UniProtKB/Swiss-Prot annotation:
Pfam families: Leptin. This is Leptin. It is linked to Leptin deficiency: A rare disease characterized by low levels of serum leptin, severe hyperphagia and intractable obesity from an early age. The gene is LEP. SUPFAM superfamilies: 4-helical cytokines.
Amino acid sequence: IQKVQDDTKTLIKTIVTRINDILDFIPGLHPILTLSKMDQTLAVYQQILTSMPSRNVIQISNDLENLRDLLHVLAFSKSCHLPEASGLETLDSLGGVLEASGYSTEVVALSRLQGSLQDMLWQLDLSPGC
């Protein structure tokens, strides 16, 4: 379990760095505290990123899948259950949270995602609920 955590922390830093290389305090999309909320949030970002492919987004999107796995492998070792995340049938509802004047939706989306990732980074050290 500790190595699962070490592997999770590492992968997160990688994605945060990848995003920098590509709004300092922009809140992520409800990135919360339990393993299920983290997973349900990552699932919403994946749907978003799938609608805006680019070299780094496709790269990031793949990493997000590896991060979700690590979150599930953890729940596994914690003998708990992560529900199947709900999916948005449409991204049209995400308009408001992804729209900003002087900023692209791609930039707002990756900026929120980075916020969520940095959020998980420290919360996972508190050995969050399930």
